[PDB]
């Protein structure tokens, strides 16, 4: 449910001395930690983060001992991240002029996490290291370090200015040491868990997505009054909105308590009488008249139903259920009930039968007693890992629109010529967004839109952060990487340059 992350950062003098073009590790590390803090602050997952620095002039640690455990300071303790951390990261943190042993940094991080995690159910425990591996050090305790890491089940990650994982011998020794630590803690899989600074930035440039949790909906799939399969339904795809809303606050006091909203009804007479809320009864319109219909009478006459129904009205061929008739604002995934082998077997039988026959199940769906009944389609979805039914709503007779449109094939004045058809063919060929894998196995998508985050939330979070930290300036423009992710690869445009010119030359487009 919660994770404790200890950001160990090097502030040694070695990082400061670097080529300006290389973007010396100090700025990169500061930016990385800042971006991490933003992502955690604007994604309220109740994750605790602490900050420890090694390589600073001062010394403040729980353990002092002798000359060891020196030049290390715990700037922040475990707690919920907040704007103060961003402000401190931006300016409060400055480089030092000393050197420290990153092994001692790991020791102090272990001590801090172990001491502060008591009393809280932190399931995860991650420790991150930001060092140049260019400081002279001695290895004399790695065995006990690894033993403690294994016993406490603490994950460890490393970030270095370089990619491999043109360096000095000290850097090679540090690389060897980090490799041995990672191998001992995890193994072969741990080799790739070391992320350079640029690689980390490439992934931390986007605010975290809105991850809501879907609550399981239990019910019974019924085929007649004799067959019943216990099922659990989840919401797979739905349009996501902002969890929070703008709250209107007074212009000067900036308090929510200082404003009040209310509604009043007044008659249509000239005197503008006042009628209380209890004096109004709801009525409807029947042609040219108005029919009073009280709420109580409507409740008495309302359509009453027995809720929580997942019933199979029938089975129909897949061709008869078209994709352009789907309605609703959700897609449901129906699985077998948890911890029930029999239900799993029954549902698997139904799914396989439908798939073999190329059929779908037309079903009646009611979320609860007061939810309006729906008629929808459940069709199979079989994958290597799991198999489930997918439910999507279908239209009633009232929701169908009967519009007639003029034909285009038979129209005499709109028939394109052969040259126009060839030009459009060239345009379609040039602007293809999929590529075959050397005509060998399958297709590959060049612009996968399902994996692009929603730009609205990114824009909102950017503007909120900019208004919090800079409470006077205007809202910035739209970042360039948002536009880049909302546009296709430059190759498509490069290939499409000329076909569009041909299209412009052939089709006589004129604006009226």
């Amino acid at each position: 449910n919660k994770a404790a992350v200890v950001l160990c950062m090097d502030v040694g003098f070695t990082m400061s001395n670097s080529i300006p073009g290389i973007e010396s590790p100090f700025e990169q590390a500061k930016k990385v930690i800042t971006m991490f803090v933003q992502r955690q602050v604007f994604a309220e997952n109740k994750d605790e983060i602490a900050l420890v620095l090694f390589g600073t002039d001062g010394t403040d640690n729980p353990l002092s001992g002798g000359d060891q455990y020196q030049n290390i300071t715990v700037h922040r303790h475990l707690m919920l991240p907040d704007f103060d951390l961003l402000e401190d990261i931006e300016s409060k943190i400055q480089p030092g002029s000393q050197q420290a042993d990153f092994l001692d940094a790991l020791i102090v991080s272990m001590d801090v996490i172990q001491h502060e995690t008591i009393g809280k159910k932190f399931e995860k425990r991650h420790i991150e290291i930001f060092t140049d591996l260019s400081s002279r050090f001695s290895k004399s305790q790695l065995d006990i370090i690894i033993h403690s890491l294994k016993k406490c089940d603490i994950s460890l990650q490393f970030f270095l200015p370089f990619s491999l994982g043109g360096i000095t011998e000290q850097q090679k020794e540090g690389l060897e040491i980090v490799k041995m630590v990672m191998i001992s803690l995890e193994g072969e899989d741990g080799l790739d868990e070391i992320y350079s600074f640029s690689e980390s930035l490439r992934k931390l440039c986007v605010f975290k997505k809105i991850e809501r949790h879907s609550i399981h909906w239990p019910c019974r799939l019924t085929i007649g009054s004799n067959l019943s399969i216990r099922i659990a339904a989840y919401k797979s795809i739905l349009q996501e909105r902002v969890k929070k809303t703008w709250t209107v606050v007074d212009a000067k006091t900036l308090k929510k308590e200082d404003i009040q909203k209310e509604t009043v009804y007044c008659l249509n007479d000239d005197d503008e009488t006042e009628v209380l809320k209890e004096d109004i009864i709801q009525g409807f319109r029947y042609g040219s008249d108005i029919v009073p219909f009280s709420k109580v009478d409507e409740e008495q006459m309302k359509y009453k139903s027995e809720g929580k129904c997942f019933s199979v009205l029938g089975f129909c061929k897949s061709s008869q259920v078209q994709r352009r008739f789907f309605m609703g604002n959700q897609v449901l995934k129906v699985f077998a009930a948890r911890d029930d082998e029999a239900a799993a077997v029954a549902l698997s039988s139904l799914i396989h039968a439908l798939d073999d026959l190329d059929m779908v199940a037309i079903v009646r769906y009611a979320y609860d007693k007061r939810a309006n009944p729906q008629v929808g389609v459940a069709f199979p979805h079989i994958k290597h890992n799991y198999e489930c039914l997918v439910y999507v709503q279908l239209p009633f007779m009232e929701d169908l629109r009967q519009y007639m449109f003029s034909s285009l094939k038979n129209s005499k004045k709109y028939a394109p010529t052969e040259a126009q058809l060839n030009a459009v063919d060239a345009l379609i060929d040039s602007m293809s967004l999929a590529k075959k894998d050397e005509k060998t196995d399958t297709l590959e998508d060049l612009f996968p839109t399902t994996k692009i985050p929603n730009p609205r939330f990114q824009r909102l979070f950017q503007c909120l952060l900019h208004r919090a930290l800079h409470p006077r300036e205007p809202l910035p423009p739209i970042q360039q990487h948002i536009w880049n992710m909302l546009n296709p690869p430059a190759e498509v445009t490069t290939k499409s340059q000329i076909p569009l010119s041909k299209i412009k030359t052939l089709f006589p487009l004129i604006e009226a």
């Binding site: 994770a3 990385v32 931390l204």
Partner: peptide, 7 residues
């Protein structure tokens, strides 16, 4: 398997 600083 994205975890650690990225999760």
């Amino acid at each position: 398997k994205p975890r650690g600083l990225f999760s």
